[PDB]
Amino acid sequence: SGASEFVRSCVNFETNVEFTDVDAYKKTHTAGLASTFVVILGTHAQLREDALKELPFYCPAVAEAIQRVKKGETYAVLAEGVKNEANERFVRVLVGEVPSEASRTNCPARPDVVASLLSAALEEIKGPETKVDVFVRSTAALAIAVAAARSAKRNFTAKEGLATRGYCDNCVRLTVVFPTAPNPSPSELAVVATSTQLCQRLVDAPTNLLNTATFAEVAQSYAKELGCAVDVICGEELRERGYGGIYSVGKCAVEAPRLVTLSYKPKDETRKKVALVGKGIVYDSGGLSLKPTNFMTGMKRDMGGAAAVFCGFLTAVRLQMPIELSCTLCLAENAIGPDAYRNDDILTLKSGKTVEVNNTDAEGRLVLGDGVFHATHEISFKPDVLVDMATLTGAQGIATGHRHAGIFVNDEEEELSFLKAGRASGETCFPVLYCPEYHVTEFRSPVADMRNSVKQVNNASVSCAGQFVANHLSPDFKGKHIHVDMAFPAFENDKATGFGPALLTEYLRNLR
Amino acid sequence: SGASEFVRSCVNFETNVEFTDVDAYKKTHTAGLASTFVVILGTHAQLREDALKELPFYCPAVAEAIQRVKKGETYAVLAEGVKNEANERFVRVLVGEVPSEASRTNCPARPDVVASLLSAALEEIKGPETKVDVFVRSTAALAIAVAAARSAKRNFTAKEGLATRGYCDNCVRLTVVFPTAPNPSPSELAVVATSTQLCQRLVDAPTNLLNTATFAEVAQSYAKELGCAVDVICGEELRERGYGGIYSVGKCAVEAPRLVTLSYKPKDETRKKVALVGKGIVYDSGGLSLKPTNFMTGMKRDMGGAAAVFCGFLTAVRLQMPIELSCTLCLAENAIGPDAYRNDDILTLKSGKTVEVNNTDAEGRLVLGDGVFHATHEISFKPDVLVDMATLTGAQGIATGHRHAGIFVNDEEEELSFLKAGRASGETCFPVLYCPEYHVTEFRSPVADMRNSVKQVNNASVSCAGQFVANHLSPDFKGKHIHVDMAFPAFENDKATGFGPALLTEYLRNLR
Amino acid sequence: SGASEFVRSCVNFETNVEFTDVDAYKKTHTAGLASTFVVILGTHAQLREDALKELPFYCPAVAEAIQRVKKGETYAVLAEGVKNEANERFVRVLVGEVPSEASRTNCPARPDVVASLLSAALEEIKGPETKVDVFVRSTAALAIAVAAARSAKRNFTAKEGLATRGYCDNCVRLTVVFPTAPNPSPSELAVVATSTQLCQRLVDAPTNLLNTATFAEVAQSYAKELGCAVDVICGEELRERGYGGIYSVGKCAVEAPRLVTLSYKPKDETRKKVALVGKGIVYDSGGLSLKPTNFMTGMKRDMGGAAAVFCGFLTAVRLQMPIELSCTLCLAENAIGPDAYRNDDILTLKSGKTVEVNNTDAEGRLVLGDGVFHATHEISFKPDVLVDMATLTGAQGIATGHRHAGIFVNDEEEELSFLKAGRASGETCFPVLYCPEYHVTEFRSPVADMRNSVKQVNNASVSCAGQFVANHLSPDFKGKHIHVDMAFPAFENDKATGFGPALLTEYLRNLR
Amino acid sequence: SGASEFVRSCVNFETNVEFTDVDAYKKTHTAGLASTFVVILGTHAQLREDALKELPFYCPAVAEAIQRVKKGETYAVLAEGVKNEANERFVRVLVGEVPSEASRTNCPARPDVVASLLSAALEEIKGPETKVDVFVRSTAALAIAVAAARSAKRNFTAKEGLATRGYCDNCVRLTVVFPTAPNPSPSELAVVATSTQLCQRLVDAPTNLLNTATFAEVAQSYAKELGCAVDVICGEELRERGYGGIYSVGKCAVEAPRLVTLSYKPKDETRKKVALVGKGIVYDSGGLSLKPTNFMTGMKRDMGGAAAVFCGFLTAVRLQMPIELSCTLCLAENAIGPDAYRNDDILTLKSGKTVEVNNTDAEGRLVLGDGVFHATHEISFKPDVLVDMATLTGAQGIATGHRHAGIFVNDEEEELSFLKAGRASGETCFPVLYCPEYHVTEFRSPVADMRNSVKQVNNASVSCAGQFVANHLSPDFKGKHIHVDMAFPAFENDKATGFGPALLTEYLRNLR
């Protein structure tokens, strides 16, 4: 009933962020400013432009704020003599200075800071459904929209009885104002913002609300709404049909494991054919290889990859992108108990390859193994590109850091393409070593085709986990393979960031 | 059947210790000494008094023992020419010297040493139901009675087939002889000794004998005997009635969790109204936050708080104290398995506050949370004082040591009062920091009202665990709150001490 | 070279904080406000008082700030139309709301929040020697002065070439304005603030600047300035004169250990006689019991106790308090190397008692042992009270938390008195268990009078370390003994707080 | 004594490998085969070519070996009827099959397998100076030469009295035979092989032979031989001239730290100007941040970076490459003792920036910091490119694995160029994240310009160590910066690989 209230919240989810521009704002709001809380974000150079002097909140207090504000920080004032709909004497104005410096591996618009400046600014807002206008000087529309959405306080929350108000603190109604009409359009940015926030909510929902059944149910309802095909292979049907990876990982849990596959065939021409596969570990105990407490917190987030691909798919269908798409969610709970798969058991994955389990907490790659094979051999079409997303390795952070998802890719060109998409979306990635000839030796088994956990921990371990998944691709698959490890990018300041869908959306938007 | 034999043992439990005085001993036993094993305990000054020279076991051997015995130690002799009922040539006499030094935070009669000297003396006794007379020179009746009771070999034991003789080695029948008629009276000391020993037996019973059902059953039978009301909220009834703390902690176990509440309304005037709440974790695995083996031994003792309050209650009813009393036992097993509450799950306690679990082994405070709210909002009366007892923190030892229970108290005066009661009973306490404004910040949650385990371990962690419990008190409760952490005082030399009931008894006896 | 520049900085240290009141501010600054950056701190009730409306920075913007500001937080505005000396259009005004809630163990004026609000407010100030006025509504002068001083950015720092400008960033000149003439007076608060900041600087100085020689040298120069007697027992003189604790702990280091004793006899006659002893471990490697890296960072702060007592002394002499005072600094570096005292070596302390070392990282209590004996047996007078201060135990935090120094005290009345002094100064304390009879057994040695490290870690270990020190008091000392463990209170947000001197000052000021 | 014998061995070092081709072999050795031990290495396709049938060891036994041999493995036969100089009945022939599969990040000629096949083949050779001919089918001359050199048993060794025969087991004289005249030439490959082996020997020499003095002495003697300028800044001269990083790291050791700089100006004019800087930690104890035993073994290899750049330089000078070159060896021992730099000390590097040490075992970046600044500000010319090489992070392995050195590079084009050079040399690299904006925040200090060890371990830690070094580049340096982390590539099967010099050689050879 808390579950079914959280399901209804996901199924009907709309965003609290709208997009417009300065001139449209001027034509529409002829009754002065339409809010009494205003955030103005730009670089030092952008904030010093004459154009700012004509904006409806500009006044001498705001000009002083611009002169005094330091890089990376906000400077708040009360602006007087700025007419407004509420007829307040004062308007609250925050000015935030964004750094201009950006490395070649980073988004030039620095949405990392935009997000955190906005986030800090919005902590002053309590009341329900308060109008806030964010005037931005960057024209990197997509990156900005993501940053705004993930910062708009639509997070999962069960504080102060909010379980009966959609597990959401509805404190902010946000309007982002670009300098000029944005590309992409306002309504596309809204669909993107909606996906980012839904992903954010799915990731931080506790497992007692989001389990394999409830997640499957969300996908099914969205499937009906969007006019998409959907297929669920549940529980014993997985064992009987040979899906020994995902089945064995999930069979101990109270809610059965499931492979959930959604399909979209566009009405217009198909420019490409793409398969998405996502690690949907709704909770990770570690299994018989039990994690210590300090590593087991935040493991409700082990379904981050499935949320990312689910929300990427949802975006692409709503934007009616000209790409044939499958989306496979690999849903399981990694529980501990008498029927838990063991360290030494030998599983037969759907690939037909045998796996000796030497670590029950290298489970995500088992479910992805079955997912990727399903995507390359069991569905209605042959994808040119396969993207698998997972929040899998604590070594991901060590390798590529908190803000760059590690990517293991079998084609230089598609890798570059995927990196460009991260830089444009602000959901940035960095490559890990692609070198299968070295990685495969880490999984040598004396009794099965392979083990699931590396012999040496100190040997390109993010890459190895990608290689394990690659080992279960259909032998006839000759297409491009992108493996994303997004363990740390999926959360910031101990809250989900909604990372993944906008990355995908940008990558897919630019396929030809 | 071993269970039901242990239940019958608890339900009919009588003590093996009786109390009298020197002059009553002289009038009654006109056939010489009534035993052939005699222990004489006092300080250096007490033992050198002329009065000793008139005692029925005094003789030249005993006088030499007194001259030679060292502080903290016993000195054993065979006394000749001391007539006795058994007509033995010799009488075994042990003389034990108690230190006189006692700090302001300690019981001046030093029952710590009395206990350990007596304990050592009674190791020479094997045979069944052997009469032993302990002549004590201290007049601190209550403290002495406790020390005697906990040292009288009525411990739980399953050695050498003793499962079929009440899980008890019935080797000693003990008579304590004070210098003068004691205050309180012999029969009150017996009731106290009975409570101490029953508590001792409950604590060291293994969980395969004492689980949530069997403990509940003991309470129910005592309820019928004493003419007290009793109420049990069991298993699914806890989930359905919103007791999400205690339910979630216990639901994985084979025996269901239970809230067991006993009530006593005195026949005569009510001087005060007091609620007792006790942590009844019959076994602690740690749950998904599994303890290492060396920390998981002695975790049958995690119900020590429930035993303490149950036995305190039982004493107060049998002494017909003029206080209206409730006693709430928070009974659960913290098991590991598929339906175990998770690190990241969000529980709704009966308080209505949401708790994000970041450590499944900070479970006692969850069950106490529901207990204290039940006691402050769901029962027939409004208590002036609430005492919650738990064996909860390994940090308790670090803070206040092995012999002083840590107390977290919201009122200086009641704290002092409670400390005086510990010093008189010899079940000593010491305060921990009371400072809610600092403790509450340790439980900040990004998704719920609070977490259950501290962010920083190094920040008054015994106090913090007390504060967590305080957070779930009914908002209308304006009364005094005493939180006792008795982890280490509950056992000594790897055996239960029966700590708690006499502390309570003394505190309650002195309320006005 | 950098060392003698840091010595000159300490020797000539003046504070950047001045104190006054509203009416004296009004008579003096008749050109309006004397700064253009203003902080106003008070409680919700204090900030809503009519009196505020007449202060020289009050205006409608500021009134709105007061209505909107949240508890524990600051709210910044630009105030227009406010008379000021610079005649700026705007004055920067920050309003900070202090909580009114304070436990019985806490300072009612909540300087903890005052400090952190001020600290946050002062992060906007970069330029040199910028005038800032802090109007406070609390009349708890002493607490406020400390909070202000420690928050005024006079910290030790070697950033950006500041080694040649006294290791100090001179960015703020601070004026604190009370509602009425403060008690104590402005010039007394300035001396106190000077002491707090000097202590703060000594504690966070690195050991390559503050070693045993340089610290000794500071004390000697201050001694000459203040007209105080001073005595140094250095290196081999310590071994030869029997100071085997402090000598053995320090003898491996490059700079020799030293006992530095300062004396002050007042001009007025006084009955009151007090000895201060401080743990001066300029760096703690752990010795042969080497600390891991994550515990060894911040161990330049192991001289916190010596800084505290040195600065308490300096305050008391500058205020010409009517108390005869000695101050003994126990200076050593705990280094690792061939001549490092060993785990198993047997030392002969000055007390004449032998100590078997079973942990080289329980070193502070060794140097304090020699310090306290020196203070109770080797100096010109017999103190009524001995206070020893040390930053010693990581268990201190576990016991009494980050903000309350643990106190081990042999006299209930003096303990209460010392607690009252912590509450008034805002440098709060809380008692630990005083029970020597239990503590002494933790130091049983089979080959010497005692060990130095507890057998059991989980047995009132802060108390035990206090007891060890007590064991080396002169046998003829019958006076009051206060042992302060200030490990965690000495730092906050990874910067020194200057904790200790004001506590002492307040305790000493109120000796009757 | 053993030291000066190891110095003489390094100074006069000649290789045991010679290079030729099939046709030149045929014209020269007209008495048939010039050895009686023959290794033939190629791929499945290469080994089945008709050309093999005409080689002087071909016979029906060898043909069967080719048909039966498995990939990655060797297959040995005794070949009969093969013309040879010794006129033996049989010639020992080993056929090794190399895989053809190579990823885009790997050397296509797979010298990794060539090396290990050759290595296995050469384990049969014991006798002194035994002639072995290796016929290879790959034309990747440079890669092959390296593989051969590092596999030719010229390793450091002190077994069986070999301390008096140059710490070298002279068991093999090796002749590598390509299909056609190789590019580069035989005599260039010999110089390269000489460098690889010398590097291999320097890396696995124990510190009791190779310390900072002895390494400095080798460099000086080579300097004289080659006609190169050389400069040494030794011990106290480093402190006095402001080199606080390298000085502080090394000052505890018995042999003083040294900055050793060699220069080469070519005879031909050249625009290209390159600086090499190498981490020369001759032994790493960890300092006060002491390593456990299992991490401290192989720490004689912490000078791997200095050996690499020293040997790269030596190659480039002997080949008279048209590049102006400096080579700075940052020589120190990281010892433990009383004058060991501390965790909390604040160092002033030559850059003029202050460093708060929060880990004494992040020492290599301190010495490199002074090295890189010296190279960019204190030498006779302004390099266009700076390459710093170090064996620094155990995280390097986690990130980029055992065979790919991690590279942190400030210019995408130069990175690609450096990667191409690793693929051609077979000393392969892979990029780590370049994103200074994220890395610099990991080194925030409250008392100095920066810390030296990351706050978070799980945040692109190889990259962060690179960034630290970058922070101490001269502010006027606008050139390209390549930071190489070669911790694991420097050793294989617990023996030094000689990694680095050939990578450099190839990169330098191809500068445009």
Numbering used by the authors:
A (entry chain A), B (entry chain A), C (entry chain B), D (entry chain B): 10 to 521
Q: What did the original publication write about this model?
A:
TcLAP-A crystallized exclusively under citrate-containing conditions, which led to the absence of one or both Mn2+ ions from the active site and hence no electron density for the inhibitors. Apo TcLAP-A and the other LAP-A structures show completely ordered active sites independent of metal or ligand binding.
We report here the X-ray structures of three kinetoplastid acidic LAPs (LAP-As from Trypanosoma brucei, Trypanosoma cruzi, and Leishmania major) which were solved in the metal-free and unliganded forms, as well as in a number of ligand complexes, providing insight into ligand binding, metal ion requirements, and oligomeric state. They form homohexamers of approximately 330 kDa with the active sites facing a central cavity separated from the bulk solvent but accessible through solvent channels.
